[PDB]
């Protein structure tokens, strides 16, 4: 709070002491630079909780999305939430993708790139066929299915980021 | 704050009252045992937020990693972050793994073991073949592909822990 000096020989001493006590006490309920057990508040600084934390409402972390055609008609849709990337494989194979080939139409942007190679497992509609697409730290994705020229690739999951 | 008694008949009364008000008021900005809207602070005790929480920076939870060859050349790399385990299947099949067999070179350590059996889906480089490896509560992983003696198994995802 913003208080007034209580000093030897001041006028209205009792009034000043009371005013200061009231302003200080007000900040034990709300406002000022203190975090309270009620009210919508914005809190700066690094806060380390050494104990257990429970959140009964929603917990919202920073979020960003990106989607692009990696190559050969394969679409990768991403959403970063904290240190996790939610992915969804989409699109439809529109040209021949060679076994073990790099997908060169779009690279995954640096901010969605993992520390180490992540293998995203997918499945082709209408049969029993699976594949995986690697996302390396470079974001230059690689197709690890066999040579394929058609089909509908799908798969939802996550991979970690730093 | 650490304050001085204000009492009937004390000397320097105004000075003592002012000193106490100032020390108390200082703790409405920083220090003491109060959590503030600024500053890097360490907070003990169980904290339950009944409302909505937003974190604009990073949210860091306890983390631990483990990696090992489960068996037959298959490597499982894990990272526990809170109640989630991030996994990555690696290695290369170096000996025959029978259909439905236990992987007995390494068990997943107890602290990375789920409550119930988790089926981790993977894919073999260069073809359309998928498999899954079960992680039971015992950590004695099981191969659910057919009998296989070669190949490069991959797959990134997560499974839950208590």
């Amino acid at each position, epitope marked *: *709070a*913003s208080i*007034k*000096k209580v000093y030897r020989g001041m006028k209205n001493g009792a009034e000043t002491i009371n*005013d200061d006590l009231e*302003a200080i006490n*007000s900040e034990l309920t709300s*406002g000022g630079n203190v975090v309270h057990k009620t009210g919508d508040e*914005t809190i700066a600084g690094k806060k380390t909780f050494t104990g257990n934390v429970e959140v009964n409402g929603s917990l919202t972390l920073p979020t960003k999305s990106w989607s692009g055609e990696l190559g050969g008609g394969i679409i990768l849709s991403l959403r970063k939430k904290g240190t996790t990337v939610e992915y969804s494989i989409g699109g439809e194979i529109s040209s021949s993708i060679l076994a073990n080939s790099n997908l060169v139409n779009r690279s995954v942007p640096n901010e969605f790139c993992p520390r180490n190679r992540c293998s995203l497992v997918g499945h082709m509609v209408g049969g029993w066929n699976a594949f995986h697409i690697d996302i390396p730290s470079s974001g230059v994705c690689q197709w690890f299915g066999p040579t394929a020229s058609s089909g509908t690739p799908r798969g939802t999951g996550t991979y970690p980021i730093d | 704050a650490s304050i001085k008694k204000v009492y009937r008949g004390m000397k320097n009364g105004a000075e003592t009252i002012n000193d106490d008000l100032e020390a108390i008021n200082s703790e409405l900005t920083s220090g003491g045992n109060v959590v503030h809207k*600024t500053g890097d602070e360490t907070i003990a005790g169980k904290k339950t937020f009944t409302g909505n929480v937003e974190v604009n920076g990073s949210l860091t939870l306890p983390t631990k990693s483990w990696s090992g060859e489960l068996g037959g050349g298959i490597i499982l790399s894990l990272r526990k972050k809170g109640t989630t385990v991030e996994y990555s299947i690696g290695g290369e099949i170096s000996s025959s793994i029978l259909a439905n067999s236990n992987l007995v070179n390494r068990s997943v350590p107890n602290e990375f073991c789920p409550r119930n059996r988790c089926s981790l889906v993977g894919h073999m480089v260069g073809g359309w073949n998928a498999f899954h490896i079960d992680i039971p509560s015992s950590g004695v992983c099981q191969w659910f592909g057919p009998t296989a003696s070669s190949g490069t198994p991959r797959g990134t995802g997560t499974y839950p822990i208590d």
Partner: nanobody
Amino acid sequence: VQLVESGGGLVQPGGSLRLSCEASGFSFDDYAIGWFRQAPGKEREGVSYISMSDGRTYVADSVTGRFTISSDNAKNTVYLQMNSLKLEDTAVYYCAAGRFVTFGSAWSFVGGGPYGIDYWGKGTLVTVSS
């Protein structure tokens, strides 16, 4: 929605300086506009504020008799006249706008954010050295 400061500089002890804050983009009916200051080596401390409605003021004990606050609602500008400057007045001074409550001569900023303040200026450096 901007608070623009000016007037900071280097002065010798006993020197004078006049800070200005151009406040625009908000009501005023509910606000007090004023000044804090902060070392790189400190948290903020409130210096002096003025009610944008009734003109009631606050002046911190560390600066009473030396610093005086003024306003002019038209130019959307608040002033801090800093006289008899001391080495310990060295800091970056931030213009601030906040909703508040008073208890006689004592004040409290009521905002949900840091220091109970809604808006901050970029800051103006005041340096007092021999």
